[PDB]
Design a protein around this nucleic acid. Sequence first.
RNA 1: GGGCGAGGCUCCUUCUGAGUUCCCUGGAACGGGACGCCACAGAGGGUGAGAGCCCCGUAUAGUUGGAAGCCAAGCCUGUGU
RNA 2: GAGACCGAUAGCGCACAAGUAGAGUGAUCGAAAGAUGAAAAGCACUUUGAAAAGAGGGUUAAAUAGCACGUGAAAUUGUUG
RNA 3: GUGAGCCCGGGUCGAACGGCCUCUAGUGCAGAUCUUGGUGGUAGUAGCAAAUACUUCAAUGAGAACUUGAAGGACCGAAGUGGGGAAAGGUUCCAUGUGAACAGCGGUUGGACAUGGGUUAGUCGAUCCUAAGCCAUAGGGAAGUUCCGUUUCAAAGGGGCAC
RNA 4: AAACUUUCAACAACGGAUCUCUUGGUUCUGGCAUCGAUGAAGAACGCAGCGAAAUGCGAUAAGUAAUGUGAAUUGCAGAAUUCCGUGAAUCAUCGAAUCUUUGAACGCACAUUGCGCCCGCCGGUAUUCCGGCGGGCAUGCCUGUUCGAGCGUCAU
Lengths: 88, 52, 50, 50, 52, 97, 133, 122, 84
Amino acid sequence: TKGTSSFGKRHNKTHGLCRRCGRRSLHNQKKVCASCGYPAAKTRKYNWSEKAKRRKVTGTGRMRYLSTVPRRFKNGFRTGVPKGARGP
Amino acid sequence: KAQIKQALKKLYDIDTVKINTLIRPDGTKKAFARLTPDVDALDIAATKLGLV
Amino acid sequence: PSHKTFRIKQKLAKAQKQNRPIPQWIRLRTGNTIRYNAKRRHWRKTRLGL
Amino acid sequence: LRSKAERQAKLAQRKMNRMARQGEADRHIHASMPKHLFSGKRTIGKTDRR
Amino acid sequence: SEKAGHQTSAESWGTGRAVARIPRVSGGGTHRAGQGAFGNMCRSGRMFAPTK
Amino acid sequence: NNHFRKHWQRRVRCHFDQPGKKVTRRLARRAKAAALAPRPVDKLRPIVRCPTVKYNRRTRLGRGFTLEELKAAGIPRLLAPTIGIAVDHRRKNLSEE
Amino acid sequence: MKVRPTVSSSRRKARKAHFSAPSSVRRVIMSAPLSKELREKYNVRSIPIRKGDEVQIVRGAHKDKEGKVTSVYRLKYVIHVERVTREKATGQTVPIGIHPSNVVITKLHLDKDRENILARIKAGREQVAKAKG
Amino acid sequence: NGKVKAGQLWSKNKEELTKILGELKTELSQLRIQKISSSGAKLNKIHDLRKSIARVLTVINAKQRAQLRLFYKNKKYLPLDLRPKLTRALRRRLSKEDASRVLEKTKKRLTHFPQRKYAVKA
Amino acid sequence: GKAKKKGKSGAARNYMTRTQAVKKLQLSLPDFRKLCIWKGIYPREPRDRRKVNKSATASTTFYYTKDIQYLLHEPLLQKFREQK
RNA sequence: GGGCGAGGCUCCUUCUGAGUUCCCUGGAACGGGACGCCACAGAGGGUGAGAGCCCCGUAUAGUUGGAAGCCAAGCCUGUGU
RNA sequence: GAGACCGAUAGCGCACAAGUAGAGUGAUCGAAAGAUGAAAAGCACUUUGAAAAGAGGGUUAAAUAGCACGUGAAAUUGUUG
RNA sequence: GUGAGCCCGGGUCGAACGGCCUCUAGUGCAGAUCUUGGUGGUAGUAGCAAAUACUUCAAUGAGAACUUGAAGGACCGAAGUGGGGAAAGGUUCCAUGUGAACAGCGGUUGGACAUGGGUUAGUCGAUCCUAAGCCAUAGGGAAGUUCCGUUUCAAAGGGGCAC
RNA sequence: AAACUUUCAACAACGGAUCUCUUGGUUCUGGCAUCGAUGAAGAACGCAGCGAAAUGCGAUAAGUAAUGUGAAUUGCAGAAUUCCGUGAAUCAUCGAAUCUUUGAACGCACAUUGCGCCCGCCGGUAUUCCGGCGGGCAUGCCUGUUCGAGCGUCAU
Ligand SMILES: [Zn+2]
């Protein structure tokens, strides 16, 4: 009865939703995320899974601030306004 | 509820006796504002809200 | 269940709003390659995984 | 335009209707070669099925 | 590329009665699962003697 | 005798960038000459004799002139590196020649 | 033969640039030659085409047809010319897309910015001619 | 109506800018109800009202920040949002004067024996 | 909603004694009396002094909490500390 | 020891040569034939089929406008606490 | 910026809303899938059917290109001889 | 042409390709219980037989055994085939409409498909308490990711009075 | 003789090989040095008149300002543009801004949209009550300020 009959008792949850990485990998009793390692300060990553590294590496998300940096470098991190521009 | 009744007073000069709230399955909040018996909700909806 | 957290209900709200077929004007656009909703969810087929 | 868009929406379902899916949400990929059915040997001791 | 045809997890199902002993992609729920891997005779596998 | 018993393919170095590196070195030398004009692109080097009995038949350029050489030539040691003369305080003059 | 290192002769990159160019680039791409009278008047060979120009079609099945440009439809790189239409089955009229390189501009829709364009092109051509002559 | 241009907004001061924000929010509030109760060309107007509110808020913020920069022009400590951003490494980088400071012996040596301009006859 | 606890609102929040006011302003008694006289902080009387302080007597002096809050921002406090 | 500094370099910007001439096939010439032209440009792409001259570009000298740096021929002055 | 490289079972797992869909409690595993036509000109109108559709009649240079769409092999199937 | 092959005719089709000499290789398939994809015979075959059971008229509809109304006959038999909850699901709930697909027969019906609507609290829960237990802090280990530690070898704070 | 089975041929099926194509990979070469408490990478939730996704963006939400170009966007609807112009655009550039809940994540927590504290401002009869808004409150360490403790060393 280790198969189909035993599968009828599966109604608990080992993992819940993790606040940091969004996956259903937060161990409800250990309070430790299996994927990102929350609540440790560092994000969990290993070199034996380059697939897992590239699933979450920089550039796979939105780059909400980092994508604007190369243009600012190209213009030299200048401040101010163009000469004769309208404004205050 | 306090923010809803203050907003109603500031926008439409509406005085309410009580307000019930529920968060709908689509995620927005719905508020049932019962007005004072002095004013008419039908008249308010006809003039200000334009719901006829 | 009827007992649910606000976070869980918010994710269910997002799933409920996403559960639709594509608008019919999408297929009439110039160079349209979208024919149907390929991420459509049903309550019997694929679990939300929450 | 509405008739044309409705015809496009109905023609978008032909492949999934040939595949006999219960709508566009049925994207279940079943196992046509299960490992428990296509690997291992049956010995004299404990077997994996009756 | 040096990693072409080798970015899969696959193990042979062993000597049996049904299928050839090529390594097969583990898991389930997708067409790739159970399909052959790592061979030069296999689709989506590593070519014989990769060019350097 | 072939030494291929380690993971040798991990650190194989090829040299397809040899002409590009020659071009880069020539551009750097042109930039250095243009910045240093009208001075020469290098410093004056002394003539020294190679060590050991195998190479002591031949002379070559050394690092820099000794303090005794600069003093006997009348060039102060602080002025010498500013007028294109390389200075080496480690070398000594063991002979007159 | 191209000499500059910033110029690419890659066909893949050229086609990607052409079919993913934004609208301001597509305006320059969608240029048309001027008629002989306009060229001798303005000393200008080509200009980007816009709405309100008068054109004559010199290539294709609608050759020698003349009319005003009613739409510059940059999304499929075409223009629509008035009365150069075809009939759908139902009897209504649908415009026929013409590429701007298949037409010649006979009358310019003139305004301040168009005059500025024509003046600076003519001045550049003249100063190039004096420098090279 | 419903389109407010930035050129006329750049000349106002704070009071009527907050006023105009008040009206534009008010017609936005009524024409949302008009949208849910009827239809027509009013959707272009609510789009224009939203962009007008954005433009007015931009002008107000720009004038406040200009006044604050004028006030903090000659002060040692500036607010963090008014300080230059650059990068974190750039802000932690040594200043030009501190990187250009040399020792007294080095200054004397550079004063009396600098790199000279010279040529060699061939 | 949640049940309130006794003594967390009303006169107990409205008044404080002189000891609590001195400890709140972190002053000495002469400096506190001097500042109260200079700023016009006057003694007050609650309806029931047991609701404000269970150890209060007839000679206990009370002040307004908002008056002590106003005294918190007086620039003479820094002057007192500088002189000390 | 200070202060000028002609001039030069780096970076974004305006602009660049010549056929849509005649005939045949074709749904459409960008094909074939004829007559020309440009070329420091016959790289590439697009345009209804293999286009130097239809269009964008391509080559070379330059030529508009703007900003910030660096190099720099020379030139003014203090003189030794 | 290039190539005596690969040309949709190849080439990166991915030329496509691909680290997506999907599977696993989880660590993780992980696809398939490009091409109408130059231009939708994507079949008006009539007729038969409840409809899907069919037949006339059309568009197109071509439907022997009908959103099952370039070309359309073999295995295998139907009709006819 | 001994041969591997080469060339032509006819039909289809729509944009590139070939001969000669050198150069180059990811260069020649019947097998590998080979890989991927597609397709046969078996075969209109095995089968679609647990949970007692259905029938009449009318309506709807192109079409009704498995839609509805009425009329009958039965079953669950209160440890129920009843009325409500906990976990789990997430809109499956309700109204209206519906081509195809799915409901291993049919289907006008449907937990399917399409468009909308629906969940109202001072008193019901959560929120508060602590249990088994888990985690900070002091401090001590550990190259380190971190381990122990939860009252400690901690200066770990409250109240009142004052001319 | 037919049917049936098989073979041969034409046409029609099934299926997607072949051929041609390629906004894509792969390899080489050249140039450059620029993340984050002034809150990064990543996550979640939202934003279009009509979008689920991809893309873009953050309640100023397929975006604002500024500069430049100069007449569009387009699937539909609705409006344009005084065209001799502070001006269309799903345009480019980009120096000014906005930037939800989170996250090294920072009041304490979080399987809770839970519980606080400090200081101002506003409103409702309000010295007390109620509500809203704004600015703050993590740890280690450095320099300095100020308030202290100890017969630890002294002077008096
Ligand atoms: Zn996590």
